C-alpha cells in the first residue's frame, strides 16, 4: 500500500450511488479531534502533516500524533511567552483579529490557490544568542526537533528524548521564565493534592484552596 502525492487528494476534493461516501462518513468527530490536535505551534510557520484521505473523500484524518519532547516544548513555550511580552509592551497599537473570518457565506478559499502560494510571515521565534544558546541553536526550532538525531532521540517514532547535560541546561535557561524556580516542595505545605483531598473530605476549606 504505497502512498500517493497530496496533489491527487486535492484534485479529488476539488472534483468530488452514494453508498461508499455515506458509509464512511460516521467518523468525522475523530477527524476533527485529529485536526485540533495536529494544529501548528507558534514556533512553526508551516507544519506539514500526514493525513488519511478517504477514497470517497468524505473525511480526511491526520494519522500523525503530536508527540513532542517535554523540555523542548517547555523551552518553546517560554520563548513564545517572552516574545509575546516583548511584542505587547512594544507594539501597543495591537489590533487583534477579534472577529469571525470574512466568509459569512463566501465559498471556502481554495488552499491550492490562496494558501499554497503566499509565503507566510515570520513566526514568533525569539532571538538566539550563540553565547548561551549554542548547544540548542539548531535544536530549538523544528516541527520535530530530533526526528533524525539517533544519538539524542530514539528515532522517527519519537519515543525517547535523552539529551546531554549542557543541552538540558540551555533548555532550562531558555525556559526559566515559565518555571517556578522552587527548591523544596515544603513551600507548598497544606496546599498539595493530599491537603486538598483532606480538606474536601472533611467538609472544610483551605483559604488558598477550593471547596
Amino acid at each position: 500500500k504505497e502512498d500517493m502525492p497530496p496533489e491527487h487528494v486535492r484534485k479529488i476534493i476539488r472534483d468530488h450511488d452514494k453508498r461508499v461516501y455515506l458509509g464512511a462518513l460516521k467518523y468525522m468527530p475523530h477527524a476533527v479531534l485529529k485536526l485540533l490536535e495536529n494544529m501548528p505551534m507558534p514556533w512553526e510557520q508551516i507544519r506539514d502533516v500526514p493525513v488519511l484521505y478517504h477514497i470517497t473523500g468524505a473525511i480526511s484524518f491526520v494519522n500523525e500524533i503530536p508527540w513532542v519532547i517535554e523540555p523542548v516544548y517547555i523551552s518553546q513555550w517560554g520563548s513564545m511567552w517572552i516574545m509575546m511580552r516583548r511584542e505587547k509592551r512594544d507594539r501597543r497599537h495591537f489590533k487583534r483579529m477579534r472577529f469571525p473570518p470574512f466568509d459569512d457565506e463566501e465559498p471556502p478559499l481554495d488552499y491550492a490557490d490562496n494558501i499554497l502560494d503566499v509565503e507566510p510571515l515570520e513566526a514568533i521565534q525569539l532571538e538566539l544568542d550563540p553565547e548561551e544558546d549554542a548547544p540548542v541553536l539548531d535544536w530549538f526550532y523544528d516541527h520535530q526537533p530530533l526526528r533524525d538525531s539517533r544519538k539524542y532521540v530514539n528515532g522517527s517514532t519519537y519515543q525517547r528524548w535523552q539529551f546531554t547535560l549542557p543541552m538540558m541546561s540551555t533548555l532550562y535557561r531558555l525556559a526559566n521564565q515559565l518555571l517556578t524556580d522552587l527548591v523544596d516542595d515544603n513551600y507548598f505545605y497544606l496546599f498539595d493534592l493530599k491537603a486538598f483531598f483532606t480538606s474536601k473530605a472533611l467538609n472544610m476549606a483551605i483559604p488558598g484552596g477550593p471547596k
Binding site: D17, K18, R19, V20
Partner: protein, 75 residues
C-alpha cells in the same frame, strides 16, 4: 380512501419518535437505495467498527452477562 371523505381538517414527526438526545428516531438515509457496492461498503464499515469495538468487548460482555444474571434474581 383518505380522511378527506369525512370532511375533516386541522384545528414521521411524532413526539414519541422524537427526543432531546439524538433528535428524532429513524435513519435520514432511506433503506431503499442499496446495491452490491452498498453491500461491500457496509461490510467494510461494519468490519472496521467491530474491530475498533473489540478492545474491552470480551470483559464488558462477560461483566454485563453476570450483571444480567444477578438482576434476574430481583427483576
Amino acid at each position: 380512501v383518505p380522511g378527506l371523505g369525512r370532511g375533516a381538517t386541522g384545528f414521521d414527526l411524532n413526539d414519541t419518535n422524537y427526543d432531546e438526545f439524538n433528535g428524532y428516531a429513524g435513519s435520514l438515509f432511506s433503506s431503499g437505495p442499496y446495491e452490491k457496492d452498498d453491500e461491500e461498503a457496509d461490510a467494510i464499515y461494519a468490519a472496521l467498527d467491530k474491530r475498533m469495538d473489540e478492545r474491552r468487548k470480551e470483559r464488558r460482555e462477560q461483566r454485563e452477562k453476570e450483571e444480567i444474571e444477578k438482576y434476574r434474581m430481583e427483576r
